[PDB]
Ligand binder design. Structure first.
Ligand SMILES: NC(=O)C1=CN([C@@H]2O[C@H](COP(=O)(O)OP(=O)(O)OC[C@H]3O[C@@H](n4cnc5c(N)ncnc54)[C@H](O)[C@@H]3O)[C@@H](O)[C@H]2O)C=CC1
Ligand SMILES: Cc1cc2nc3c(=O)[nH]c(=O)nc-3n(C[C@H](O)[C@H](O)[C@H](O)COP(=O)(O)O)c2cc1C
Ligand code: SF4
Ligand code: SF4
Ligand code: SF4
Ligand code: FES
Ligand code: FES
Ligand SMILES: [K+]
Lengths: 263, 430, 213, 44
């Protein structure tokens, strides 16, 4: 075979050429923190959360984008990997709004959870945060853009899976806004799935909005009947009442998406 | 040789730097350009690459990567994709105005450099990405390109050598980050000038996904002179691994701000006193010098006394050579206000792609805006240091490095002035 | 300073904009500079061409560039909002851009910014009421040894004093067009107390060309 | 007569707004035939 040997924390693993650092760490059972990487979207590399130390190399690499070279020792838990994660989590939480009680992502937030797991416990940002104009992209997806961390899973999903090309980033620098630039209504057949992949509560479900909260929901694994695809879903209920419908991953059917009628 | 400087006019590459001679083809051929270009193009890519490697030319953009080793990355058989030279003519660096003078006053030297470098790397064409604010310079370069096509020097059967080579000029639209090479490549492709993550380097996937070398105007324009005059000629200047001549842009608090060509390892004091008329108020009036444009850390007057203006000596002076743009700041300078205007520049010129620059350059600008007024406390200084260390090396391109480095230079050489600023704010506002 | 669009009666997708036929020939010349299959690479010049015909970019020039290049309109909106030259609002006929970065601030560009403000009766960002002058404040224009300098629509006006920029504004208000260069004694970028370099004549063809060539 | 005292770059005083683009239109005939990726766009 053409498998190259790399090392994750000293453990040998045989990987295909072209495999990234993140996938090599996944093959030894370690999940690198990420915000913009998504395994069904194109590699962006613009949140810098996956920065990891390769040893004998004085610069961290973006594990979601960097291919492994033969003989690398990926240090997923070293001192400068943790310092990189804390610095990037500090910059993500600098201008992020204190909305966790009134945000629907609370409890099932990637930003909350891997701030608890990989960032620090306190703030140094002594300034005033930014605030972003909200957008009206339709009756399904509520949009609160102050919570946006600009990971561009919006744009990659709408471009590559939904095939729409109507989301994007306007502006430049810290005023860079994810949006449509116009009053445009993002109504695709797969338009609600951006609620899934948005790691923050910038894009939430407008019908699910404010009604429940993820830890109190019971997760019943079930099947879509809205068409003959047979999409695997999670009906999340709460005290004998159906709260919402999430997808299940099935690699051969619905990869991890569902349609808007299903959702 | 131990002392460097005092460069002779016969050893200049950029004759007609000042517009006193004709910039067109009748003037450029009368100064040595487009002479024996066919005999250079017929000796093969390997000879031209060996002349550039032999000359010790390093990248005049400012990183100082070895230009022959860089251009040899393209010397490989094709796979169906075309290959491209792309000449980085953006020049957005505050302090730096040398490539404007190369494009505007020696344009045929740049076009001949495009032809020689594209033959060296097997490139199909040259895309000169000129800054859009350089409109008259771009029309100037297009007139020279039209004169080169009408003389058969480029295009179909370039210089009668059987090599086909176009030269295109693409204008920018007002982004300093479109001088970064991958963001420039994205800007040519009709996109936001957002830098790519490396690898792939542009020699693998560059403009339109082709093999591409992005190279500065100066490091392209000196290459026909390196091929004619020889590699040993250009390597006989400056220190070792510091070979050649260099354009310098001495601006700020000097008597005569100017662009001048000078030998590589010239002293900074000798350069400022000789070509720029010296610091205003005398050399005792000198407070700081930013050696190579805004991205390099400043060095104070104690360092500027004996420092040499090549790459390695300024690295030993814990700064960089950069674009060799000498920004001179005398004792009458609010230096915190100057570095904070510089951080304001770096947050207006930042494409917002990755998190540490998009958030931390704005956060550094807010901390520096409070440091100008002194509306802070000294524990925020080292804090700001750490913020810069969270941006340096954690970004996609080096604009995070170029925005973290002036903060680090200002803290490192002028922490007491920051502290007395803040304590006088404290004693007069409470 | 907004990076969203709202449909006003003077800026909407039914605002009249179309290229002149000579601008279509220029667009064809632009599009033939790029490879086949990469027509999107002509977004930046053509849109700027739409800024040269019109003076500013409504959202009918962006949609027209999106139509004639077969690119999605959001990908033109991104380029129009990313880059600082594209006027998404109607500026005056003379667009004054005063560089105030550190090498121009050291040579007192604030005096010229204040002089343009008190001469035109406006401040930074505003427009004179006769729609002739828009005064904004830009970053490094790459004329640092010719500091302090401004830019008027294509032209660099360099080595300026307040009297020099008042003279330039006066002969802009008189209908003439000034000379784009330094307003001090020197010509382009030389040391102002005479040439410290390139005083010899240039050597010409064949000088120093090595053997074997 | 070796002149070193006059600025020989007086042409850019006479440039208009379409100078660059008219020069591109003039240069459109001298240039080599463009390469093709084999498809009309990456969305084709
Ligand atoms: N000339 C100007 O107007 C400006 C210049 N700069 C300078 O630019 C520099 C940063 O620019 P970058 O190109 O991002 O940094 P630098 O680290 O990457 O690389 C310089 C060149 O070497 C090539 N290179 C480096 N390592 C390579 C490798 N292992 N394999 C293949 N190619 C390799 C890169 O592709 C690039 O073309 C700084 O030194 C800064 O001072 C910054 C702003 C303005
Ligand atoms: C933010 C940023 C801006 C840059 N701007 C320019 C520029 O305007 N002109 C330039 O020649 N190089 C610029 N560079 C350096 C380029 O990335 C690249 O190294 C150079 O253009 C060509 O490499 P060379 O110096 O080896 O020739 C910039 C780099 C960065 C990080
Ligand atoms: S997106 Fe996450 S971190 Fe931000 S307010 Fe909502 S729950 Fe909190
Ligand atoms: S709204 Fe969500 S998915 Fe979209 S770019 Fe922002 S954080 Fe990413
Ligand atoms: S560090 Fe700044 S300049 Fe570089 S890719 Fe990120 S936003 Fe862009
Ligand atoms: S996950 Fe690799 S940078 Fe966003
Ligand atoms: S600083 Fe004003 S032109 Fe460069
Ligand atoms: K979400």
């Amino acid at each position: 075979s053409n498998l190259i040997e790399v090392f994750v924390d000293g453990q040998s693993v045989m990987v295909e050429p072209g495999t990234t650092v993140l996938q090599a760490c996944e093959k030894v059972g370690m999940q690198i923190p990420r915000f913009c990487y998504h395994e069904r979207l194109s590699v962006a590399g613009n949140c810098r959360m996956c920065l990891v130390e390769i040893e004998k190399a004085p610069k961290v690499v973006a594990a979601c984008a960097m291919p492994v070279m033969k003989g690398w020792n990926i240090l997923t838990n070293s001192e400068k990997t943790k310092k990189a994660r804390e610095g990037v989590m500090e910059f993500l939480l600098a201008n992020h709004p204190l909305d966790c009680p009134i945000c629907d992502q609370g409890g099932e937030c990637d930003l909350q959870d891997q701030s608890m797991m990989f960032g620090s416990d306190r703030s140094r940002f002594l300034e005033g945060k930014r605030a972003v104009e909200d957008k009206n992209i339709g009756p399904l997806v509520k949009t609160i853009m102050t919570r946006c961390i600009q990971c561009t899973r919006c744009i990659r999903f709408a471009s590559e899976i939904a095939g729409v090309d109507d989301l994007g980033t306007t502006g430049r620098g810290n005023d860079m806004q994810v949006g449509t630039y116009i009053e445009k209504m993002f109504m695709s057949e797969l338009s609600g799935n951006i609620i899934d992949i948005c790691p923050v509560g910038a894009l939430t479900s407008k019908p699910y909005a404010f009604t429940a909260r993820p830890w109190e929901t019971r997760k019943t694994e079930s099947i879509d009947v809205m068409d003959a695809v047979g999409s695997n879903i999670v009906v999340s209920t709460r005290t004998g009442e159906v709260m919402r419908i999430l997808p299940r991953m099935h690699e051969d059917i619905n990869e991890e998406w569902i349609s808007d009628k299903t959702r | 040789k131990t002392s460097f400087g005092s460069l002779k006019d016969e050893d200049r590459i950029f004759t007609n730097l000042y517009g006193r001679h004709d910039w067109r083809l009748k003037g450029a051929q009368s100064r040595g350009d487009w002479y024996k270009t066919k005999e250079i193009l017929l000796k093969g890519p390997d000879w031209i690459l060996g002349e550039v490697k032999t000359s010790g030319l390093r990248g005049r953009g400012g990183a100082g990567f070895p230009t022959g080793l860089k251009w040899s990355f393209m010397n490989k058989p094709s796979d169906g994709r075309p290959k491209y030279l792309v000449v980085n003519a953006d020049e957005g660096e505050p302090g730096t105005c040398k490539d404007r003078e190369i494009i505007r006053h020696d344009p045929h030297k740049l076009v001949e450099g495009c032809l020689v470098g594209g033959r060296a790397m097997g490139a199909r064409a040259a895309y000169i990405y000129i800054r859009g604010e350089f409109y008259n310079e771009a029309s100037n370069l297009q007139v020279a390109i039209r004169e080169a096509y009408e003389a058969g020097l480029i295009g179909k059967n370039a210089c009668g050598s059987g090599y086909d080579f176009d030269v295109f000029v693409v204008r920018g639209a007002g982004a300093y980050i479109c001088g970064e090479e991958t963001a420039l490549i994205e800007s040519i492709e009709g996109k936001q000038g957002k830098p790519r993550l490396k690898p792939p380097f542009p020699a693998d996937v560059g403009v339109f996904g082709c093999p591409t070398t992005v190279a500065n105007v100066e490091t392209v324009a000196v290459s026909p002179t390196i091929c004619r005059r020889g590699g040993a000629w250009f390597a006989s200047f400056g220190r070792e691994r510091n070979s050649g001549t260099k354009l310098f842009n001495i601006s700020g608090h000097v008597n005569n701000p100017c662009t001048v060509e000078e030998e590589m390892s010239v002293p900074l004091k000798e350069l400022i006193e000789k070509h720029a008329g010296g610091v205003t108020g005398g050399w005792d009036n000198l407070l700081a010098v930013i050696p190579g444009g805004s991205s390099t850390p400043l060095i104070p007057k104690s360092v500027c006394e004996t420092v040499l203006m090549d790459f390695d000596a300024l690295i030993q002076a814990q700064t960089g050579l950069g674009t060799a743009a000498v920004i001179v700041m005398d004792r009458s300078t609010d230096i915190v206000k100057a570095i904070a205007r510089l951080i304001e520049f770096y947050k207006h010129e930042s494409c917002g792609q990755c998190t540490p620059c998009r958030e931390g350059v704005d956060w550094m600008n807010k901390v520096m805006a409070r440091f100008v007024r002194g509306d802070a406390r000294p524990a925020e200084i080292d804090s700001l240091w750490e913020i810069s260390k969270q941006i340096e090396g954690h970004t996609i391109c080096a604009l995070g490095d170029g925005a973290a480095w002036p903060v680090q230079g200002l803290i490192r050489h002028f922490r007491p002035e920051l502290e007395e600023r803040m304590q006088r704010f404290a004693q007069q506002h409470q | 300073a907004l990076f969203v669009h709202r449909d006003t009666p003077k800026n909407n997708p039914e605002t009249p904009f179309d290229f002149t036929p000579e601008n279509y020939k220029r667009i064809e010349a632009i599009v033939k500079n790029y490879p086949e299959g990469h027509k999107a690479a002509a977004v930046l010049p053509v849109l700027d061409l739409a800024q040269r015909q019109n003076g500013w970019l409504p959202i009918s020039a962006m949609n027209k560039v999106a139509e004639i290049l077969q690119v999605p309109p959001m990908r033109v909106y991104e380029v129009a909002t990313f880059y600082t030259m594209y006027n998404r609002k109607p500026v005056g006929k003379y667009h004054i851009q005063v560089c105030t970065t550190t090498p121009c601030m050291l040579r007192n560009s604030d005096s010229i910014l204040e002089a343009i403000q008190k001469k035109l009766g406006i401040k930074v960002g505003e427009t004179t009421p006769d729609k002739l002058f828009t005064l904004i404040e830009v970053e490094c224009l790459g004329a640092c040894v010719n500091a302090p300098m401004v830019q008027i629509n294509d032209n660099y006006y360099e080595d300026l004093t307040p009297k020099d920029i008042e003279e330039i504004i006066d002969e802009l208000k008189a209908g003439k067009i000034p000379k784009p260069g330094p307003r001090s004694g020197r010509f382009s970028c030389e040391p102002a107390g005479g040439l410290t370099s390139l005083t010899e004549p240039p050597k010409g063809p064949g000088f120093g060309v090595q053997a074997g060539l | 007569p070796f002149d070193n005292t006059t600025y020989k770059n007086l042409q850019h005083h006479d440039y208009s707004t379409y100078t660059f683009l008219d020069l591109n239109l003039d240069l459109s005939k001298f240039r080599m035939p463009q390469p093709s990726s084999g498809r009309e766009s990456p969305r084709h």
